[PDB]
Design a protein around this nucleic acid. Structure first.
Ligand SMILES: [Mg+2]
Ligand SMILES: [Mg+2]
Ligand SMILES: [Mg+2]
Ligand SMILES: [Mg+2]
Lengths: 175, 190, 138, 199
RNA sequence: GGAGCCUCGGUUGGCCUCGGAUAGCCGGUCCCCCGCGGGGUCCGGUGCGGAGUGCCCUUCGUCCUGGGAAACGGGGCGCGGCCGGAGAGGCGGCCGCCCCCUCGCCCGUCACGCACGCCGUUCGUGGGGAACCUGGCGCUAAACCAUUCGUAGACGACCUGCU
RNA sequence: CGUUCAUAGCGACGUCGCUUUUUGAUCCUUCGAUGUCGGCUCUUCCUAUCAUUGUGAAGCAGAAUUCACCAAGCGUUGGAU
RNA sequence: ACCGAACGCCGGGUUAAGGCGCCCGAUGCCGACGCUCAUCAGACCCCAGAAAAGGUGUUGGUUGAUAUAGACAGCAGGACGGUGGCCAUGGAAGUCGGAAUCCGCUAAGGAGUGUGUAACAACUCACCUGCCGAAUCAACUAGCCCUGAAAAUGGAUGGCGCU
RNA sequence: CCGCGGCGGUGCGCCGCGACCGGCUCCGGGACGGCUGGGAAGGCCCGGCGGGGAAGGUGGCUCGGCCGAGUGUUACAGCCCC
């Protein structure tokens, strides 16, 4: 895999039926992926690690997007992981604070890139769970649990640095 | 990570007056003024209260090393206040096994000659950091007193005369000679 | 020595982005560098918007930290923010900067003529004031 | 037609970049008060980095060698010339448009002198980072004329104070004169605020 | 003042505070200190900067006459005095006297090859350099060679002497 | 081991390195020829520091001394075979 | 000799691989999220350079703990008796070593962490209080940074430079 | 010779235009299908039914002029949220 911004996909699939299994059991997976074509690949990869079930043995029954039913809320996601190291694999549990499960998943991947130089193919998302204000462990997130939350905007470095490339005025960063 | 706000108070007492021009605390009171510029520390020195009763030092969005100044500024401001109110008096005894360490201030508390250390012909003339003044003690025998308002300037000037008296090429476990700083104090307690 | 603060219910002018030139009252801060924002009256949807873009005003209307659009709308219309904004120097000097930009090449000429004259009537008056200040000094 | 940039508070190689490209487009550029220019990263760091550059020299005949200028003007001009094609004619032609100065002398002391914000320390460094002043760096590396440049520049700033003061006085007269006059200029000034000035 | 090769770029100006950035800018001081200014406090204003380079200045057809608003401003490479400027000054400013004009803003009122749809127009410009015709006031050589010297010298170079 | 005490100074059993002032491997370059060893003279460079500067260490009391740092500024000699 | 792509002579368009401070065509995006400061920073297949082992530098994880039954650090108080306990005498009454390794008083102290003794003594190191007053500590792990890291003409992320 | 009538090919040199076709490269408009017969939202509100942050509340303390601001506790709804 790679990225861009992920979505959620509900893939479901079954080992396709034989004489010896006339109505095989469907399976479902929260895939997070930049598009349905890869979602489905990703689905298989996971299924096969779990069940004896390869793409050629099976079919994907229903792959489709899953939209955030609470977009305009802001939520704290816990999110459990299983990345790889330059050494051996680890598990983690990180927390993000976002408007959409996708958003938080993407916002995870990026972080893992930064904090651990973990590429996507290295990473497995095992669950993403919206959470209460409480239950949140990470004080990164918990500093945004406040009702009278206030902060200034301090050394507010200018952009538009080349609009006026040259000029009279030295700028001003206090706002 | 970044921390949305840390901050701290300093109770300035009624004896003192403090101002602040921007980020440059100025402290005056009994013994005189003591300024200190904190351009280099990136904080919001809110002086607040009627009767101007406390200084308060914000720090928004600090990462670990940024936050750690917050206190240190505050601490430097107490010590400013302290010197204005009380003063600093760094006592330093002379310690020698044989050659007594003959000290003699000169200009006022500025110069400090230090003859017959280890029997050395060389006399260690030691100026002070200006604002400080050494003197010799009465009552206690082998003993200086470095009075001054600015802690930094005092302590530095102490060290100077601590360091002047070192031994070269010998075993300092054995050769325990010199002036060393016995006690850090004030000019008047209250 | 700060004055404008990212609060719940602080009004923000949006410097740039899609909704530039529009006001918007922060509902709620999601993140270190991203706020969940609203502009009920101003024609801006409940949406996340980063701080990067939203330079922020002296106004702060008062509703609860996670409002439901109706209620921040009510807050807005009560305080008459949209009037108050428009009588601010800021929003006036936006309009000013809009109106110079709109200027037709005919208007441009008109203006040019006007200022040509309007500067002359000052420059003489300045001359006089200088001449009179020299007489006082003598 | 001429760019005069106050070198002060820029980042050495940042401003150089802009200047280079300008100079190659045929803009006659003058930088000025270079010794104000400040290089990112802490001092000791950069002094060491200049001291490498002084270590460089042709063994057999140093006299031929990389010509380590010590003057902070030259030092800037060297780093522009590193961002030009200076062996060619067009690169040398460009470099003859750049004019640099140790402090700021008579033709440009009385000129509105620009700033490039993209080169500006207060914009490009984080405020928790160290940086050399070039002035210092030159100084310790062999530049003579620091004090002389400084002490001429005090005399420049004193003279400028006076100019500014007198400007302020004329501005105050204008403001007063408009208030004296307003009623006889009303039906101009009005039109300048219907077409977007004055407000 | 007249022609006449050549070299080219250009095709309104901006005549200046210092600087700060977890801050600034301007006022006015009722009040206090210093040398009309400087410093201070206090208060009043601005501050996504309008006392803004997102800016400011300047106008871009010519003339006529015959009203208004604005009005003593402009000129004659007009002419004499007093200044400031040394970082590579190279530029201003302010004061006397002579003559001439009615310029900016609105309008009336006509006319100016209107060259008949069509390109390098429009300026800095009396530009930089070279050769040629006019007036006024000034000027009146050193260098090299040869000769000499020996503080010098392979040769040149150098150091000296000669109504 | 070091009276004692693993680490002042050492360091087995093991292990990881750097270096090209050793020698090997190798055979790319040169056999229409790159003068084949030393010494002499002269310059310069390196540091992996013997000495000298300034320093930390000791089983440094002084004296002598090892161990380590900054350090290549300046030295590093005359002779018998 | 890699990666892209394989050639008649050209106009327009588009691409690959690689790029886009400037050298140098293109980021002069108000590009997004982190991490990171190096007195030897780093900076892109083949490739032209480093390891084991360390680091309260910082940033993440993992697992345990602690704890208003009153902590954690910081200072203050005690650290005993059965007991020269057994083996070892060369002396080990806790203390060159080794098998042991329990009870009493307990608030609580190990048949004892060290320091020191020929051997003791003496000193030192739990459990609890007072001031104190809410959170605090350990072991792992992995990202960037650092230590580990020495060569000879002056020198090479291609250069300038870049935080 | 004047007709530059009709046709055919041409222009001395420099240029400009126009409409048509080929190819590109962009721009501005509108109309539709599908989906969890899209998700959220908006707007009118009514009836209930609980749960939580934390409130026109109260309370200890602090800071300003009974009122305003800042912390703290139990927590109904006379701020909202679910
Ligand atoms: Mg032993
Ligand atoms: Mg040869
Ligand atoms: Mg070394
Ligand atoms: Mg010794």
């Amino acid at each position: 895999k790679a990225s861009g911004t992920l979505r959620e996909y509900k893939v479901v699939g079954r080992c396709l039926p034989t004489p010896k299994c006339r109505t095989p059991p469907l399976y479902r997976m929260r895939i997070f992926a930049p598009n349905h074509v890869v979602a489905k690949s990703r689905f298989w990869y996971f299924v096969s690690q779990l069940k004896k079930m390869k793409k050629s043995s099976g079919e994907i029954v229903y792959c489709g997007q899953v939209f955030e039913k609470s977009p305009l809320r802001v939520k704290n996601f816990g999110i459990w992981l299983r990345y790889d190291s330059r050494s051996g694999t680890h598990n983690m549990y990180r927390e993000y604070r976002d408007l959409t499960t996708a958003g938080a998943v993407t916002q995870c991947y990026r972080d893992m890139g930064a904090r651990h130089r973990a590429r996507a193919h290295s990473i497995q998302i095992m669950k993403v769970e919206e959470i209460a204000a409480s239950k949140c462990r990470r004080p990164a997130v918990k500093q945004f649990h406040d009702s009278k939350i206030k902060f200034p905007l301090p050394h507010r470095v200018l952009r538009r640095q080349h609009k006026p490339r040259f000029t009279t005025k030295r700028p001003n960063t206090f706002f | 990570m970044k921390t949305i706000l840390s901050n701290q108070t300093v109770d300035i007492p009624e004896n003192v007056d403090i101002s602040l021009k921007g980020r440059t605390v100025i402290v005056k009171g009994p013994r005189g003024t003591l300024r200190r510029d904190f351009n280099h520390i990136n904080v919001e020195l809110s002086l607040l209260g009627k009767k101007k009763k406390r200084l308060r030092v914000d720090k928004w969005w600090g990462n670990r090393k940024e936050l750690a100044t917050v206190r240190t500024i505050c601490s430097h401001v107490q010590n400013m206040i302290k010197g204005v109110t009380l003063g600093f008096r760094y006592k330093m005894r002379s310690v020698y096994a044989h050659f007594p360490i003959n000290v003699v201030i000169q200009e006022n508390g500025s110069l400090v000659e230090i003859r017959n250390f280890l029997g050395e012909k060389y006399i260690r003339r030691v100026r002070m950091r200006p604002g400080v003044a050494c003197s010799v003690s009465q009552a206690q025998k082998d003993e200086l007193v470095l009075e001054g308002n600015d802690i930094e300037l005092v302590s530095n000037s102490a060290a100077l005369i601590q360091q002047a008296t070192t031994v070269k090429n010998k075993d300092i476990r054995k050769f325990l000679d010199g002036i060393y700083v016995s006690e850090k104090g004030t000019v008047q307690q209250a | 020595v700060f004055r404008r603060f990212v609060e719940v219910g602080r009004v923000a002018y949006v410097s740039f982005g899609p909704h530039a030139g529009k006001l918007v009252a922060i509902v709620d801060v999601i993140d270190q560098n991203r706020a969940l924002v609203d502009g009920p009256c101003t024609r801006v949807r409940r949406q996340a918007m980063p701080f990067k873009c939203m330079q922020l005003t002296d106004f702060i209307l008062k509703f609860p930290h996670s409002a439901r659009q109706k209620y921040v709308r009510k807050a807005w219309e009560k305080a008459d923010i949209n009037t108050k904004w428009a009588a601010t120097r800021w929003a006036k000097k936006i309009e000013a900067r809009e109106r110079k930009a709109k200027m037709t090449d005919f208007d441009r000429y008109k203006v040019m003529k006007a200022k040509k004259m309007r500067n002359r009537i000052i420059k003489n008056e300045v001359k006089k004031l200088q001449r009179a200040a020299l007489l006082k000094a003598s | 037609q001429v760019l005069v940039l106050d070198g002060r508070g820029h980042l050495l190689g940042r401003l150089a970049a802009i200047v280079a490209k300008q100079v190659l487009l045929g803009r006659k550029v003058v930088v000025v008060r270079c010794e104000g220019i400040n290089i990112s990263g802490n001092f000791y760091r950069n002094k060491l980095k200049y001291l490498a550059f002084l270590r460089k020299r042709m063994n057999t005949n140093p006299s031929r060698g990389p010509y380590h200028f010590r003057a902070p003007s030259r030092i800037f001009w060297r780093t522009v010339r590193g961002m030009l094609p200076h062996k060619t004619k067009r690169g040398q032609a460009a470099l003859d448009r750049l004019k640099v100065f140790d402090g700021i002398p008579p033709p440009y002391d009385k000129k509105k002198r620009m700033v490039v914000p993209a080169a500006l320390k207060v914009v490009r460094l984080k405020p928790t980072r160290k940086f050399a002043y070039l002035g210092r760096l030159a100084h310790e590396v062999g530049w003579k004329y620091q004090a002389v440049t400084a002490t001429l520049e005090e005399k420049r700033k004193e003279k400028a104070k006076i100019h500014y003061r007198k400007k302020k006085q004329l501005m105050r007269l204008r403001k007063q004169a408009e208030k004296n006059v307003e009623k006889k200029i009303d039906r101009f000034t009005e039109v300048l605020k219907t077409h977007g000035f004055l407000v």
